Amino acid sequence: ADVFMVPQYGYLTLNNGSQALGRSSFYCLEYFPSQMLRTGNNFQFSYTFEDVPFHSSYAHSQSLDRLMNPLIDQYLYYLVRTQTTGTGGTQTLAFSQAGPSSMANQARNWVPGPCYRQQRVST
Amino acid sequence: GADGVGNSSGNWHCDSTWLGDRVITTSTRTWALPTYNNHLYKQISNGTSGGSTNDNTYFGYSTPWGYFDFNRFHCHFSPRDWQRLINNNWGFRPKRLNFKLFNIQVKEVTTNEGTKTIANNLTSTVQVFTDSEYQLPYVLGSAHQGCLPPFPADVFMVPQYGYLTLNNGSQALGRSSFYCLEYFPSQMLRTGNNFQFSYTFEDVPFHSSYAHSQSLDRLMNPLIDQYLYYLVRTQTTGTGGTQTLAFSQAGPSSMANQARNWVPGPCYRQQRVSTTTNQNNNSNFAWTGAAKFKLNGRDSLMNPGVAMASHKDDDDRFFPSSGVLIFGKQGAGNDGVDYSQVLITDEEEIKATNPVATEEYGAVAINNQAANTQAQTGLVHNQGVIPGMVWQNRDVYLQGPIWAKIPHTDGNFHPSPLMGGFGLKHPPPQILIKNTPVPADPPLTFNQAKLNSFITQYSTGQVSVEIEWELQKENSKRWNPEIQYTSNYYKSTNVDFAVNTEGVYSEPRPIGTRYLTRNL
Amino acid sequence: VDYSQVLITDEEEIKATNPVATEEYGAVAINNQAANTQAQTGLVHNQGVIPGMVWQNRDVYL
Amino acid sequence: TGQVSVEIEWELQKENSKRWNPEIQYTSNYYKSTNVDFAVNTEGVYSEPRPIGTRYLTRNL
Amino acid sequence: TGQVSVEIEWELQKENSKRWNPEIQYTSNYYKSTNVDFAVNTEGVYSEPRPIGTRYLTRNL
Amino acid sequence: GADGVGNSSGNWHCDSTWLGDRVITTSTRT
Amino acid sequence: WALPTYNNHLYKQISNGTSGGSTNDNTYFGYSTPWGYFDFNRFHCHFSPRDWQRLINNNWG
Amino acid sequence: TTNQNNNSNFAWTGAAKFKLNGRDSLMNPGVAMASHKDDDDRFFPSSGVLIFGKQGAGNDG
Ligand SMILES: Nc1ncnc2c1ncn2[C@H]1C[C@H](O)[C@@H](COP(=O)(O)O)O1
Ligand SMILES: [Cl-]
Ligand SMILES: [Cl-]
Ligand code: NA
Ligand code: NA
Numbered sequence: 001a002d003v004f005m006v007p008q009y010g011y012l013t014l015n016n017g018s019q020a021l022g023r024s025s026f027y028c029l030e031y032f033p034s035q036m037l038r039t040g041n042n043f044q045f046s047y048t049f050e051d052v053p054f055h056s057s058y059a060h061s062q063s064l065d066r067l068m069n070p071l072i073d074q075y076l077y078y079l080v081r082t083q084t085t086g087t088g089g090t091q092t093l094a095f096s097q098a099g100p101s102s103m104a105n106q107a108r109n110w111v112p113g114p115c116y117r118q119q120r121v122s123t
Numbered sequence: 124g125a126d127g128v129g130n131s132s133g134n135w136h137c138d139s140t141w142l143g144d145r146v147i148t149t150s151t152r153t154w155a156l157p158t159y160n161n162h163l164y165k166q167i168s169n170g171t172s173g174g175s176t177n178d179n180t181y182f183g184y185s186t187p188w189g190y191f192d193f194n195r196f197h198c199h200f201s202p203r204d205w206q207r208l209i210n211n212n213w214g215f216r217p218k219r220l221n222f223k224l225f226n227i228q229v230k231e232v233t234t235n236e237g238t239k240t241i242a243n244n245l246t247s248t249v250q251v252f253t254d255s256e257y258q259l260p261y262v263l264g265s266a267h268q269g270c271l272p273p274f275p276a277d278v279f280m281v282p283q284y285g286y287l288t289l290n291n292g293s294q295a296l297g298r299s300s301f302y303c304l305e306y307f308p309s310q311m312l313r314t315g316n317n318f319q320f321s322y323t324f325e326d327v328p329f330h331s332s333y334a335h336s337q338s339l340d341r342l343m344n345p346l347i348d349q350y351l352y353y354l355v356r357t358q359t360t361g362t363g364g365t366q367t368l369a370f371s372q373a374g375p376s377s378m379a380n381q382a383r384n385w386v387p388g389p390c391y392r393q394q395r396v397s398t399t400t401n402q403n404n405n406s407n408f409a410w411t412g413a414a415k416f417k418l419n420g421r422d423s424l425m426n427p428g429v430a431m432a433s434h435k436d437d438d439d440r441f442f443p444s445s446g447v448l449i450f451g452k453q454g455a456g457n458d459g460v461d462y463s464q465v466l467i468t469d470e471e472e473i474k475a476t477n478p479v480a481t482e483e484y485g486a487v488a489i490n491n492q493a494a495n496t497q498a499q500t501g502l503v504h505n506q507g508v509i510p511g512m513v514w515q516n517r518d519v520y521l522q523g524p525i526w527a528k529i530p531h532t533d534g535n536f537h538p539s540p541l542m543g544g545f546g547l548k549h550p551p552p553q554i555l556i557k558n559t560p561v562p563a564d565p566p567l568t569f570n571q572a573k574l575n576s577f578i579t580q581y582s583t584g585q586v587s588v589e590i591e592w593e594l595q596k597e598n599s600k601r602w603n604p605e606i607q608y609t610s611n612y613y614k615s616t617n618v619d620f621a622v623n624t625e626g627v628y629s630e631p632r633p634i635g636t637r638y639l640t641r642n643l
Numbered sequence: 644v645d646y647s648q649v650l651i652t653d654e655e656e657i658k659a660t661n662p663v664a665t666e667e668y669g670a671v672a673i674n675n676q677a678a679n680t681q682a683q684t685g686l687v688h689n690q691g692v693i694p695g696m697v698w699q700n701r702d703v704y705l
Numbered sequence: 706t707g708q709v710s711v712e713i714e715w716e717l718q719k720e721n722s723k724r725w726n727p728e729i730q731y732t733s734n735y736y737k738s739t740n741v742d743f744a745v746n747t748e749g750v751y752s753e754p755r756p757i758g759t760r761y762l763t764r765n766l
Numbered sequence: 767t768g769q770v771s772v773e774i775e776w777e778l779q780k781e782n783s784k785r786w787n788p789e790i791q792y793t794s795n796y797y798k799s800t801n802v803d804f805a806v807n808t809e810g811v812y813s814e815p816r817p818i819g820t821r822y823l824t825r826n827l
Numbered sequence: 828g829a830d831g832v833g834n835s836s837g838n839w840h841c842d843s844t845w846l847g848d849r850v851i852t853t854s855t856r857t
Numbered sequence: 858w859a860l861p862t863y864n865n866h867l868y869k870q871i872s873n874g875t876s877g878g879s880t881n882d883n884t885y886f887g888y889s890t891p892w893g894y895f896d897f898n899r900f901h902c903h904f905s906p907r908d909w910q911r912l913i914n915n916n917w918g
Numbered sequence: 919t920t921n922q923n924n925n926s927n928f929a930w931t932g933a934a935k936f937k938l939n940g941r942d943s944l945m946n947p948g949v950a951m952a953s954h955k956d957d958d959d960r961f962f963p964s965s966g967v968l969i970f971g972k973q974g975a976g977n978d979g
Pocket of ligand 4 (some may be wrong): 185
């Protein structure tokens with residue numbers, strides 16, 4: 001129902017401060033073949049979107065980390081300890097097969113996406 | 124007859140055939156299926172509460188179903204075959220496969236007064252079906268045990284299927300999804316009944332069986348000098364110490380200075396650890412030391428990390444704490460096993476194009492040089508991809524993984540499984556099997572309850588996986604003999620990759636893929 | 644304008660594959676472990692793309 | 706002044722999920738209120754009460 | 767003992783509404799819980815948490 | 828053979844399919 | 858729609874300077890034209906709230 | 919300009935580099951980046967641009 005105002009066109013060019021550079025380009029719309037109308041005159045056209053990937057309307061139901069069966073244990077080992085447990089405190093190499101209980105340790109084929117730190121703020 | 128009880132419903136095919144590029148592998152093993160979860164879907168969660176940490180929390184379900192996994196190279200390749208493939212090809216990749224289930228036999232076990240007897244239930248059935256539409260959580264590619272045995276003779280147990288869903292602590296979220304296998308059109312079998320299908324691998328890049336014979340840095344002719352200059356000095360030599368700009372053409376002698384078109388691959392710093400006990404610092408830094416990525420407030424270990432050289436030359440003892448695959452020696456214990464039991468793989472072959480795992484990527488200037496201020500530089504421990512980088516993917520081993528399902532995500536980069544292998548969007552479908560519940564006699568008067576009593580039984584049968592691989596022959600004009608995997612002549616009490624005196628096949632070491640050398 | 648006027652969108656749906664906005668990506672070792680020297684690790688606040696990553700694009704709204 | 710017309714053809718991609726339990730979905734709460742969501746108010750001012758996402762349906766990883 | 771199979775073909779009648787605002791719809795609440803709605807519990811006992819009606823979509827009189 | 832003891836005398840169909848108006852339900856229980 | 862006359866039928870040079878209160882990061886150089894433009898780049902234009910609902914609640918993309 | 923630069927031979931120590939196989943090689947000519955922000959024309963990356971000798975120029979120093 002609402003009736004709206006048409007936005008004004010304007011553009012930006014390379015600038016240093018409040019000055020323009022040699023490169024900066026000035027466009028004149030009138031230098032464009034445009035069609036004219038009088039009432040009882042109409043304009044129209046058609047365009048076809050280049051092929052683009054479907055937007056994802058689906059939210060995952062498995063975390064990237066939790067991609068493996070709980071029941072089974074990986075055939076691969078990880079370094080579980082650099083030092084002997086208890087009083088002795090002498091360096092040793094201990095290896096364990098990542099299991100269901102030790103989920104965090106187990107190896108994965110995929111890792112999380114990229115990130116740029118964003119400052120946190122509370123409502 | 125077509126399908127009867129006194130009739131082999133399939134044969135044993137265990138052969139490898141080489142013609143031209145195409146090498147065909149065929150394996151057959153004898154499996155046994157136990158009843159799982161008493162024919163019950165069970166909710167399984169690990170809580171925040173109790174000893175367990177927050178990073179090991181999860182929510183999911185354990186199903187009464189078993190699954191067939193062949194995702195390990197040793198299944199389709201004899202050690203001798205792995206040798207032929209590694210020692211003469213610059214690459215290879217899967218093309219198509221063929222699966223078969225047959226000679227299914229279902230046994231019903233009875234126990235009275237400490238007397239146990241196992242006989243046949245012929246009328247009993249076994250359900251099978253393939254997740255051809257990928258509607259079921261993908262188990263495979265998680266390096267889980269339960270794949271066909273390496274040795275053909277061995278008889279193996281079928282892995283139990285179970286999956287994970289979004290969780291907070293020991294709780295599920297609204298999003299988390301519960302799947303019922305029975306809600307899947309599955310085919311049923313009675314002995315003399317057989318199942319089978321075929322799949323064709325989507326096109327994938329040939330794995331690299333070749334190790335570079337030129338470093339990325341050393342890509343230029345020694346004799347010639349570059350037509351380009353570099354800034355060689357900021358200050359006059361000797362006593363004067365007055366700033367000046369001197370430029371030199373990078374030559375053969377000054378190789379490091381000269382400009383290059385390509386730069387090394389990406390790196391995530393990996394803590395270094397030495398096989399020798401004494402060298403290592405006396406702290407349990409296995410976890411605190413190790414690099415990790417934090418997702419959804421939970422820190423998971425970066426295993427096995429991006430592909431990086433295990434060590435710089437002569438640092439053979441060194442390895443990343445989490446940055447390489449590790450394979451247990453046969454008979455090795457699951458928990459807290461000694462170093463001797465484990466086989467730590469080594470990815471040094473790729474050192475030429477990839478960064479060393481334990482060292483910085485390099486250095487970058489931290490500030491603008493000033494008339495008063497001195498130039499500064501900072502180390503790069505974490506380095507992401509940038510234009511001009513080139514790198515090598517992590518190697519696969521005779522007992523490594525083969526493929527992995529690329530997560531259905533909006534985007535990803537160089538989706539080659541980090542544990543090594545071929546990244547497929549539509550990998551070989553998960554094959555699900557289950558013994559059909561056979562109820563114990565019901566009570567005489569109708570009960571609204573669901574039957575909780577069943578005859579105890581398990582099933583057994585042969586399985587056949589046949590895969591057609593496409594090879595990519597070597598074209599090298601290298602004049603000298605190349606390095607190759609061989610078995611040492613010198614005598615020993617046991618033969619490599621054979622059964623021992625007890626009948627226990629054992630894989631003495633991991634076997635890489637890159638022996639043949641190709642130019643950069 | 645006051646907070647009440649604004650509608651702050653929420654992209655938590657993608658938390659499963661994407662890093663939390665306010666937290667580090669994770670940690671990397673800063674030095675080689677030594678017989679005398681202790682292992683060290685540093686946080687990753689800025690993390691670029693590397694082989695093996697997967698992620699979700701930002702959502703669109705009505 | 707004049708009318709303008711934009712017509713767009715969108716291609717959908719149906720759900721294939723075998724999820725057994727009910728999925729989450731955008732709904733308008735039953736509980737009474739003085740104004741209707743996404744309607745004009747007593748003055749004739751359409752208003753968009755909240756942002757509306759796109760991902761409600763769940764798919765596996 | 768044996769298996770039984772019932773297959774039924776249902777005929778739908780799509781919605782034609784020109785209602786401008788979002789309609790009410792059956793959804794599963796996001797907020798966390800120890801068990802999932804319409805799933806098996808820790809013991810293997812599927813349970814139907816509530817009755818589920820048929821009328822959510824609204825049509826004129 | 829057509830009908831024998833060592834032969835599945837039927838399969839498990841538990842699927843739902845939506846095309847146009849027609850929605851097809853299929854259930855199998857033991 | 859309604860179209861006002863823009864810039865008195867004039868192309869005008871517009872710049873924001875370093876000088877004065879404005880910072881350096883808000884400096885710019887450009888031009889404002891006597892032309893107007895039609896923009897439909899917002900989802901709500903083509904979708905009724907009810908329609909947005911149907912699309913979100915039943916499609917994976 | 920000679921005077922502006924700090925009085926040290928930081929040609930190598932200063933410069934960014936990538937370490938491969940235990941050997942540090944200079945990052946020349948680096949990723950593609952702007953040589954200077956406006957009016958910083960005198961400035962250049964120590965190793966971050968191509969350099970061509972004037973004809974008859976000497977190879978060393
Ligand atoms: N193993 C494996 N599986 C799937 N996708 C892969 C694999 N290795 C590389 N890639 C990626 C890398 C590119 O994005 C693309 C092939 O392009 P190209 O120019 O040929 O590298 O596929
Ligand atoms: Cl083992
Ligand atoms: Cl010259
Ligand atoms: Na269990
Ligand atoms: Na103006």
